[PDB]
Ligand binder design. Structure first.
Ligand SMILES: *[C@@H]1O[C@H](CO)[C@@H](O)[C@H](O)[C@H]1NC(C)=O
Lengths: 338, 362
């Protein structure tokens, strides 16, 4: 038996569901989960949970973190020589004993805004995933002499949202770039319709990996141009096999067996597969970073710093008949169009 | 005293309002017997069978609903048997005796708001289930006053292609450069129509949408609010009077386990008409007891035709709808209808429509 640790926070029920799915189907060297769910993602509770998991004895911990508790978790993981595989937002700078599965969206977003050749737009953002995207956008705008009006919408309510939208309507902007959480993006999309801006003339850019994970039917009927990114490939027989087997299990324990998996579920499944590959290779840190596998999100391979390399991501546009792929982005070939 | 009922299927709020009216108007001196039935008003055979069953046990008065395909049968049966039938359904056209009607007429108000707003070349989206009694008046008025109508038949639409058809209607009207439409359909239809409007857009400034279904505070305007398009409508139950406030104070208290509904702030106009019907009927029999006054349906008039009909038609009372006093035929004669319009804020009073003065602006 090989012992593994599991750390999860609130409003990530599907993450835990995907983790339990992966563990169940992989075992049926049986893994021994040590999950300890925590409600509030603060430093003290995360530290206590990590201490409990370490005291019980763990070889690798799969956990989730936010802006506040990232530093403590990374510090203890680096200090105690315990590998931590996480699907959360990537960090910056030198990091050790930390493996990150979520690819960085900076390059693809920069390439997309370069392709459409924009010189003035509005950037809506939140600080729930660091300041990397905002800093990169500001640096690029300064280098290329652009005109960006970044507005924080962390503490905005419906009245504030509508008034801000009307004020931005008074000026001629016509181009928005949204980068927020799933719930925040849903709120933005459900209050942009009420004002009456889901009409031809605007071009929104959804900056995430869940373009097909959100409902854009209203925008499809409206005709407003929308462009997003996709990482999970749905025509692969592997994902169809896994999803059909998900249907074959009960819904009382593994909810979500009626929709294609989001980016985070695929990331957690790929992390579990990578960790199992690492154990199997170790049967025959340095070994962890040498893994090269084919997961739901494509090729999985890491450099000496634990960041993603050799990853492909498709770019989708919203048409009258629905989403339509227009090309794909790669690190070595930059943007490729069809 | 026994008073039956022919309430329709798919309607539960009305019958809840009926039982609440039963409870509220307590009567120790006399008590009536509901003996309520339930069937599809669109099928004439069930209606005739239920009417005969009620008539076979000596019911003094019947109270129920009907539609365009069943009003003639009820009228014919009540005419020959002298049994009064109180109905909050749509006003019938022509003098049909022994049918007490408790709904004001939309006609005349839609033609007094379409002229207070000086218009021409408008659009009209009618439905072919309520009846061709409002569209005909609109055509007559347009012919008399040189207006240009563009009639469209909404309804009788397959649910599979309902979205596509409703969207295509607005898409076609966009080609003809029409910006004024007059929606007049039941709540279920108008909700879908405004939803598809918002889906296409058209809720920005430059479009005026009249709702012509009374009500206007129960169609979930929150979706169409906070936009640029104008919204205007008619209302019968004002929500600030002492009587209506007293009603709504006890309306929310009752639970849905025993009394379905009764947890929301607004109530449909039909249920208010039913609740007022309860009171006007109980007081009608009260007046007769103050004055100290059947075989099969396929067989002679029964004991007291005039004594019940005239007494019930000479009532003068005040309820949620306002003044309730019937004329010789049985239709309302002293009703006032509030005018409302939608803004960034909730509905605001603009005036009132009455028989004594054509149109009032306040
Ligand atoms: C909306 O209402 C205003 C104020 O009454 C009026 O001036 C304007 O013409 C209306 N718009 C339409 C499209 O009817």
């Amino acid at each position: 038996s090989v012992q593994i640790g599991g750390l999860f926070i609130r409003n990530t029920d599907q993450e835990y569901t995907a983790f339990r799915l992966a563990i169940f189907l992989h075992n049926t060297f049986n893994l021994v989960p040590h999950v300890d769910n925590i409600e509030t993602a603060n430093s003290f509770a995360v530290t206590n949970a990590f201490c409990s998991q370490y005291s019980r004895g763990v070889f690798a911990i799969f956990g989730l973190y936010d802006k506040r508790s990232v530093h403590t978790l990374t510090s203890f993981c680096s200090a105690l020589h315990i590998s931590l595989i996480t699907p959360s937002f990537p960090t910056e700078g030198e990091s050790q004993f930390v493996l990150q599965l979520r690819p960085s969206l900076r390059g693809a977003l920069l390439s997309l805004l370069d392709h459409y050749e924009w010189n003035c737009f509005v950037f809506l953002y939140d600080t729930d995933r660091g300041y990397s995207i905002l800093q990169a956008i500001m640096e690029k705008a300064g280098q290329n002499g652009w005109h960006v009006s970044a507005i924080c919408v962390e503490n905005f309510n419906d009245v504030s949202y509508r008034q801000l939208l009307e004020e931005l309507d008074r000026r001629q902007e016509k181009k928005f770039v949204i980068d927020c959480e799933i719930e925040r993006l849903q709120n933005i999309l459900e209050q942009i319709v009420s004002v009456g801006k889901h009409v031809k003339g605007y071009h929104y850019i959804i900056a995430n990996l869940g373009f097909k994970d959100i409902s854009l039917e209203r925008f499809i009927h409206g005709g407003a141009n929308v462009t997003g990114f996709q990482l999970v490939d749905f025509n692969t027989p592997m994902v169809t096999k896994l999803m059909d087997r998900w249907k074959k299990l009960d819904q009382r324990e593994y909810p979500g067996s009626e929709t294609p998996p989001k980016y985070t579920s695929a990331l957690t499944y790929d992390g579990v597969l990578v960790m199992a590959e690492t154990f199997r290779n170790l049967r025959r840190e340095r070994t962890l970073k040498q893994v090269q596998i084919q997961g739901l999100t494509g090729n999985v391979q890491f450099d000496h710093y634990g960041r993603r390399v050799n990853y492909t991501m498709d770019v989708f546009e919203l048409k009258s008949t629905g989403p339509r792929k227009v090309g794909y982005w790669n690190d070595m070939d930059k943007l490729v169009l069809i | 005293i026994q008073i039956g009922g022919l309430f329709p299927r798919g309607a539960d709020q009305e019958y809840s309002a009926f039982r609440v009216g039963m409870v509220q108007f307590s009567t120790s001196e006399f008590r009536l017997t509901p003996h309520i039935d339930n069937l599809e008003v669109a099928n004439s055979f069930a209606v005739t069978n239920a009417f005969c069953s009620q008539f076979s046990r000596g019911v003094y008065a019947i109270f129920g609903f009907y539609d365009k395909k069943s009003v003639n049968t009820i009228t014919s049966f009540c005419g020959t048997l002298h049994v009064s039938f109180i109905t909050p359904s749509f006003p019938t056209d022509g003098t049909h005796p022994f049918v007490i009607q408790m709904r004001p007429d939309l006609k005349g108000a839609l033609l007094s708001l379409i002229e207070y707003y000086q218009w021409d070349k408008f659009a009209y989206l009618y439905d072919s289930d309520r009846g061709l009694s409002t569209l005909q008046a609109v055509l007559d008025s347009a012919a008399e006053k040189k207006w240009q109508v563009t009639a469209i038949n909404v309804g009788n639409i397959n649910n599979d292609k309902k979205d596509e058809t409703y969207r295509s209607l607005f898409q076609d009207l966009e080609l003809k450069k029409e910006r004024r439409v007059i929606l007049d359909c039941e709540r279920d239809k108008v909700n879908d129509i405004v939803d598809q409007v918002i889906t296409i857009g058209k809720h920005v400034k430059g479009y005026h949408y009249i709702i012509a279904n009374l009500g206007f505070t129960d169609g979930d305007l929150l979706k169409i609010q906070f936009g640029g398009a104008n919204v205007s409508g008619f209302q019968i139950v004002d929500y600030d009077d002492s009587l209506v406030s007293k009603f709504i104070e006890r309306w929310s208290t009752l639970e849905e386990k025993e009394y379905p509904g009764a947890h929301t702030t607004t109530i449909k106009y039909t249920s208010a008409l039913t609740y007022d019907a309860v009171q006007v009927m109980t007081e009608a029999f009260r007046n007769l007891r103050k004055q100290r006054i059947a075989g099969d349906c396929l067989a002679v008039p029964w004991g007291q035709g005039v004594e019940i009909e005239r007494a019930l038609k000479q009532v003068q009372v005040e309820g949620l709808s306002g003044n309730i006093k019937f004329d010789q035929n049985g239709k309302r004669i002293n009703y006032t209808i509030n005018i409302m319009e939608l803004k960034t804020n909730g509905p605001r009073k603009i005036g009132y429509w009455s028989e004594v003065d054509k149109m009032v602006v306040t």
